[PDB]
């Protein structure tokens, strides 16, 4: 009953934002990518406007708003990180609330000047976070209400990740912010405020450091490397995630559209922690562990 | 065991040119496509290179050939169609043999620029034809050789595809880029035809737009009236809502009844397969289409959907 | 004094458009292209600002309206055809006045739809017709307007703009994003046709292909046989040559240009309309047979 | 009489190169750029192909090869630096000299690998090194070369104002330019190497995106020089009356300060500069794009680091 315009969806993700739409009962009126391979479209809303060029949607959107049966409700963004910011300023200033993919914003500046436009238009963000949604990290942040977390996420990327905008640390934001967010999200969810925050590795393919929550004491490393990959897992599986707690190794996004919609959706402020957390990992000075704080993978 | 390059790899298509090199037992080894969303390449071929440049694609395609081990042997096309003939260009000249999607080419003078190329680089193109691999089509050029009966057969082509918005915002949607809707939709349809029914000797366009056209095929053994379109409301009334698609092919009244990219590549790699020789009956098929002047329909030759035409 | 925007910054036509801010006083601040190569805008206005991609160039312009200071008053454009609407739509809904290239936008129907939002938005689009500011042609309408002739004058025209291989890999070799001939390269002589002769009564076709065209129009005070090409083919690398009654016309205006939208004289959807709909007529004409003289010599 | 194509050929620098091929007496048959606002062609070699696809370049350059008459001599490129490398490559592999913009390529192990091209094509890459062609800078040369035991005190200072969208251009990606010192400063290293001889140190004060000061040493001079983009580093009494200010002192004297077909008639006589030559100053900048930044000791900081 309500309609979605969706920037980015030609893209890896869009499907499962194209799925949360039609599950939840809503249509998806109008798409925009810069790429026109996206045909996939086609199977779940076939009625959909496309274009190509931002100016085109653009007018399209602001015609639909003449009408309060054809006007958008939602603006949902799938674009690569860099772009996020001003897909969030033109869905706010089109009369929309927006739902955005993590990472939001780089910074938690632009946070500050996003929750500005919001005020100017009476509109909102929401951010995906589904790992919040999961069955698992509630029943651990129901069961936390200082632990010993160890956090390992290792992911194979072949030859063209590094090639796309996901290699570009002007496009992506790093590591931290690209690959690690959500993970930084989640362990705020569960385990409270960040105390410390500090990097010991850091390069195109991989990074590692050290977070103190209230509740955590958290060493992590995250790759796109698979020669990161433990001996004992090479060969066997493209992805090593491993998060341990004090030893004890522990759809979504349709859910999280749910939420959404039904007024109990991730805004701003649930969203700051984690943007400033990549924020100071993005431009932190590397510093040699101590106190047994620095993965054993370094 | 063979060496694969693919070029358009991030689109549609080209999850099955991937999936049939890898289940031939060969190996992709690197990749080209201007968008970078590829990702889908690390589930069938992890160590690939990926370019989204030409320039540096050729280069390291340059670099493979230092050793024999290395060099490519086949360059895969994918890209719009438009974009064909400059790929396969490349690739012969490179040093590889070339596999490309149909349509080849849009005429048969680029045609016999093509096989130009192939005699000055010693390498050879090949064209995916994926049809003629098919038991059913094979099965009807065999009941049509032997059966020899003295009337030709009466044959109704109608294959509408639900396109959406996108489409015609896409390069499927320019002209000068798609080459049109009977040499985009209809070029594998037509060579099937003739791999059938043999050599064509007429060819009529009663109505051509950017969203369907119709005319009238003869051929050795067939009269075809035709009908093509990627527009959802020429659906017939008990398909509608129910199916994007309707592909009827009946042959005297009876209707036609049919991993293709697979079979197509083992073919190829067998020593089989279908160069320049064997595409160019469907190239010059589509290129007299696309240029055709409309007539009106005579002599029972138009296709039920242009009934309402003026004649 | 006056704040300006420009769309289109990084090509051809861009640099007169810079030099008419500058020149009457005023102020480029943002410039927005998809190509970067833009160097001449240090030399011309170096504080502007720049971007390449819409998404940024309008949150930029949009945060410019929160002080009176630095919000853009005009918003100028000068990218290919078929993006001069949504840029014209886009730059009203900002805010800002726009002024934007010829041929303004294809179809009358576009221009029903922007005089829309000039209501919703309470600016106005401006459009360049710098040849209504040449000396010659001023003249000849006063000449025109003077006389007394009941009898209509007899004008031929001929425009043939070869250039070279490029010319047809651009946008302007696209159908599609130029429009065609009669909009792309005819545009202005057919507003400059009214503008001496006014109303148009007749419009008619005798050829017309992606390269070239030709017909005959007849206006309240002429008739006129008109031919025009890329085609270098067809020259007798440009020829251009108009006649009235037989005898040959003798003929920066951009900075003139925005000086009188600047005075409140720029002319608006009412005066390009008549061009448009000429073009429009043209660009989807039916060919006729050439009678009654009515055929430009050249076909 | 020699056939050139030119990659780039849409961008600032690129009529300089259409000019040079038609003041030597040469052709341009061929043109490739990714945009199409190309038209200034048409004032230099209106007879001349023009392409924005790789692909259709390509061809039609292999196509040309079946007439001498009509076959490519040179492949002449302006693109962006980080892809000056393909396209030398490709050039060289049509069966081209090549003639490239500085920098030539970012790194050293760079120029190896485009000299086992050279040696697998049997074809040549030139590179734009146009201040040895400066008059004032080849008498400095020779006037160094033929005197003195003691080294020249060097002040070299480069401010060349640039608004808002250079950075916002290929210019201001790390990736593409390779940064400030290699894409603005490269041929002044170049012509302090020239005249000067051999590096023997390279330190590094101050880098950012929009400007950068260090200090080396040669054998013949000790060198303190700082490069900007940024117009606040103008001398007060330039500012508003030049947006460029290029000053180089020897021994606290002032030096006494069309170069592009002079390049051309050079490469086009035997003269031109290969790897061989271009390997010292991309030896230079490699160093330091990828220093690490010291405080100025001994008086070695440039004066504007203050
Ligand atoms: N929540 C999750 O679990 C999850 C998983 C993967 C990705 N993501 C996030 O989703 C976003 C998309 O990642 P992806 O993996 O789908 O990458 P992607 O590269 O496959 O898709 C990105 C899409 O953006 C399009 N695009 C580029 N510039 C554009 C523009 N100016 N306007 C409109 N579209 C434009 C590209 O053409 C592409 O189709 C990123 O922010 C990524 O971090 C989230
Ligand atoms: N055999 C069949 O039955 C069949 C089925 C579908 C498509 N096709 C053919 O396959 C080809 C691709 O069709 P598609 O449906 O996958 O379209 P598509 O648009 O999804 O894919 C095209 C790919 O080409 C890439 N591309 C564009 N320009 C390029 C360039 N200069 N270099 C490299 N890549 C470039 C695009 O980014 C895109 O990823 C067409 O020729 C089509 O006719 C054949
Ligand atoms: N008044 C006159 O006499 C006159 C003369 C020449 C051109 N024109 C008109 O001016 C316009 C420009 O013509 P031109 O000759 O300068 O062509 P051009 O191709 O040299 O310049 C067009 C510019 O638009 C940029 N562009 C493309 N897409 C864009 C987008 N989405 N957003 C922003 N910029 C984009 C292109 O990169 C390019 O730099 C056309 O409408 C043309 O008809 C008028
Ligand atoms: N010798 C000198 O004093 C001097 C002066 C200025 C520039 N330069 C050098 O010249 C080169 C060009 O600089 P510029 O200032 O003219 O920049 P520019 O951005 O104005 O020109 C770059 C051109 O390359 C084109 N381009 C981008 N990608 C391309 C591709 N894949 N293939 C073909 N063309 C592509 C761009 O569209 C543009 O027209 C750089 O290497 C620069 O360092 C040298």
């Known amino acids: 009953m309500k309609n979605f315009a969706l ?12 799925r949360a739409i039609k599950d939840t009962g809503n249509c998806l009126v109008s798409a925009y990518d810069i790429n026109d391979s996206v045909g996939i479209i086609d199977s779940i809303s076939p009625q959909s406007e ?16 003449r009408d309060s049966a054809t006007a958008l409700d939602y603006v949902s963004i799938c674009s690569p990180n860099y772009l996020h910011y001003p897909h969030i300023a033109a869905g706010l200033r089109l009369g929309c609330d927006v739902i955005c993919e993590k990472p939001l914003v780089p910074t938690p500046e632009m946070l500050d000047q996003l929750a500005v436009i ?27 209400a200082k632990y010993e977390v160890d956090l390992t996420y290792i992911t194979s990327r072949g030859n063209w990740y590094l ?40 390069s195109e393919y991989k990074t590692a450091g050290y977070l103190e929550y209230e509740q955590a004491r958290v ?4 790759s796109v490397d698979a020669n990161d990959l433990p001996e004992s897992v090479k060969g066997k599986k493209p992805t090593y995630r491993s998060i341990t707690v004090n ?10 559209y749910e939420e959404i919609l039904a007024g109990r959706g991730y805004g701003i402020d649930d969203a700051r922690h984690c943007v400033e ?10 510093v040699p562990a101590s106190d047994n704080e620095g993965h054993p993978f370094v």
Do not use: C
């Open 163 to 202: 090639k796309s905008w996901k290699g570009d640390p002007r496009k992506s934001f790093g590591v931290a912010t690209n690959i690690g967010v959500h993970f930084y999200d989640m362990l705020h969810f569960i385990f409270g405020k960040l105390q410390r925050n500090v990097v010991h590795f850091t």
């Open 7 to 18: 920037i980015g969806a030609a893209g890896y993700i869009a499907p499962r934002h194209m």
């Open 277 to 286: 957390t990549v924020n100071t990992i993005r431009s932190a000075v590397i």
């Open 247 to 256: 030893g004890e190794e522990m759809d979504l996004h349709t859910t999280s």
């Open 50 to 65: 496309f274009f190509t060029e931002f100016e085109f949607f653009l007018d399209h959107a602001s015609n639909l708003k």
């Open 118 to 144: 919001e005020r100017e238009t009476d509109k909102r963000l929401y951010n995906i976070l589904q790992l919040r949604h999961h069955q698992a990290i509630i029943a651990l942040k129901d069961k936390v």
């Open 219 to 222: 060493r992590w490393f995250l």
